Design a protein around this ligand. Structure first.
Ligand SMILES: CC(C)(COP(=O)(O)OP(=O)(O)OC[C@H]1O[C@@H](n2cnc3c(N)ncnc32)[C@H](O)[C@@H]1OP(=O)(O)O)[C@@H](O)C(=O)NCCC(=O)NCCSC(=O)CCCC(=O)O
Ligand SMILES: CC(C)(COP(=O)(O)OP(=O)(O)OC[C@H]1O[C@@H](n2cnc3c(N)ncnc32)[C@H](O)[C@@H]1OP(=O)(O)O)[C@@H](O)C(=O)NCCC(=O)NCCSC(=O)CCCC(=O)O
Lengths: 327, 326
């Protein structure tokens, strides 16, 4: 009897340390306002000693569970979209479920870089509709511990955060996920990467510190590919939901870079004014950006029935996706 | 579309065959020690230059060809792995790229030894929701994470990939009849790698050993995993309104032969209905079930009406079971 899913609850969490552009600009020897003019970021949050990825996910998730007024037994599945799990084994999701007291919930990690959340949303929707039970979806990242401070292009963008949504089963049609498009382009696999620690170059004694840290090979190629991926996926989910950009109530792009948000907005003819923008205070926390923005915009103005959200993201991989969601 | 079908099966291993004798000699063991305690006889390990995505690609490609499916037809690739090529990006986009799946999304799932059952459950949900084919690969190179001095893990773990092509099917009362996915984080520390994640990032001056698996209490892991596989199996059987006697083939995760026997015993299922690949292929985490599916399908093609009981437990703790009807 389940025909759709609903975003029944929202949440987000950051570590407490607020890092202004001025601190980073000092470390990298750039004049004042460099970061804000080129990225739209004004400050970001970075994790501190003691802060764990699963604990950050836990705070966002608890906020979303309480927002939904859902009992913790009712969560059948927890999807944790992250690139930065506590350990390389086991995944962080079973610990997140445990910390939240979700005793009947399965749990698994999804690694889809900055696109991870949209994949998890899509797969969760298919679970809710197939099984008629609720799913908790958390995206969270502590990228700060992966930042190469000497690499200006990445050290100025990436941030730590978590966002969470509780999806519940709904009997009605023509609502929920109207369309979804998940893409990949592995020719760009090498554009955003960590060299060491996977199976191709396991972490070894005496490795170059920087080999454990993120690198962005071609910031301009990455910009072009990501804009194309977000535009093209957005475009086809709009057509499949039979909506136009003028019909979207809120546009929630991945918060990669304000200039990319602008590029996609322009390409689709979507007002900036309908576009949720959280990069100014929260930076680029990869897969976490879209659910943190959803929590923020819902906090500002509760999502009203009939509103349409366009969610889109692109990330390392390359990966990309878009979702048309009707409240 | 009302169901999914496993339209193709595939598996792959690296080229280095490792007999028990070599691991027993390294560890100062008596002959037959590994086989007595695990039922493993030999395992495949990666060689230098082998990559997880390449291994996954060989299994995936065998499954795509087995499905007689146009590469254009794959809308989504799910890669269940614990051992991606790199910590960033995920390996799934590279895997999809080398297989020529130009219309496929791609993402890694990390569910330890349960990953394939989560992937299958989530892929089946996708197929039935969107009416498009999904490629599900599970692959691991655990050999590069084995602490060779730790007997409990060095004698078990192995490298493999297995793949299943799931295609949309119009008819009801077949395919995935029921699925049950569980987690128990109170056992999270039992199977762990200390360094490398965000809790203890890998740094200059680290042990390197700290980058490798440790099993802190094999006996406790054993008990918890037998319980999780048993309970999930019972509940998928109840939901599918089947008894164990109705199951044509039982395909548990190949962790350890004593564990396959204990799970069989709890569920009342005969060893003769149980697929057992651990003797030649070892414990390759989430890869075991699809590798075994490919093997058993090679021995005897899956016939319509046959019912498969799939079940696994792993680090997390995680677990799951699936009832599938051909
Ligand atoms: C916006 C720009 C044009 C520049 O922004 P920026 O970061 O401030 O870059 P920048 O390099 O400091 O600016 C220099 C840029 O200005 C130009 N330039 C200036 N001087 C030169 C020169 N000597 N030779 C050649 N080009 C030069 C080039 O366009 C430079 O770009 P580049 O060096 O290639 O980054 C772009 O290059 C860029 O960096 N875009 C953002 C990349 C991005 O958004 N990455 C994140 C995607 S999401 C993801 O998945 C998250 C992490 C993974 C995960 O864990 O999931
Ligand atoms: C049947 C066995 C015994 C298996 O045998 P084994 O593991 O190869 O061997 P072992 O446990 O080392 O057996 C030897 C046992 O002899 C004991 N022993 C010997 N001398 C002493 C002493 N002086 N004092 C105290 N204990 C002593 C040891 O403690 C050993 O027991 P233990 O390690 O506690 O099981 C079972 O009890 C067991 O250990 N099971 C757990 C292994 C398992 O099932 N693993 C797979 C889970 S799947 C998964 O998710 C994969 C991980 C990675 C990934 O998914 O990515």
């Amino acid at each position: 009897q389940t025909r759709s899913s609903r975003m029944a609850g929202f949440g987000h969490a950051v570590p407490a340390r607020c890092v202004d552009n001025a601190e980073i600009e000092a470390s990298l020897g750039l004049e004042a306002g460099w970061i804000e003019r080129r990225t739209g970021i004004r400050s970001r949050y970075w994790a501190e000693a003691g802060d764990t990825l699963s604990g950050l996910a836990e705070r966002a998730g608890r906020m979303a569970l309480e927002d939904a007024k859902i009992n913790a037994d009712d969560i059948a599945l927890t999807l944790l979209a992250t690139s930065t799990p506590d350990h390389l084994l086991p995944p962080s999701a079973p610990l997140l479920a445990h910390r939240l007291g979700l005793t009947r919930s399965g749990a698994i990690d999804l690694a889809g870089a900055s696109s991870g959340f949209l994949y998890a949303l899509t797969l969760a929707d298919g679970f809710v509709r197939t099984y008629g039970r609720a799913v908790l979806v958390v995206a969270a990242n502590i990228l700060s511990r992966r930042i190469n401070p000497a690499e200006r292009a990445s050290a100025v963008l990436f941030a730590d955060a978590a966002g969470a949504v509780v999806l519940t089963p709904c009997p009605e049609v023509k609502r929920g996920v109207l369309s979804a498009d998940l893409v990949a382009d592995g020719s760009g696999y090498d554009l955003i990467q960590i060299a060491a620690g996977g199976s191709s170059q396991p972490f070894s004694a005496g490795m170059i510190a920087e080999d454990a840290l993120m690198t962005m090979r071609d910031g301009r190629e990455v910009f072009s590919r990501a804009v194309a991926l977000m535009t093209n996926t957005s475009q086809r989910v709009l057509h499949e939901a039979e909506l136009t950009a003028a019909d979207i109530s809120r546009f929630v792009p991945h918060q990669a870079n304000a200039r990319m948000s602008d590029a996609v907005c322009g390409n689709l003819g979507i007002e900036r004014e309908k576009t949720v923008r959280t990069i100014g205070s929260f930076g680029n926390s990869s897969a976490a950006t879209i659910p943190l923005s959803l929590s923020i915009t819902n906090a500002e103005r509760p999502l009203a029935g009939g509103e349409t959200l366009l969610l889109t993201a692109a990330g390392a991989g390359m990966t990309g996706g878009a979702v048309v969601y009707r409240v």
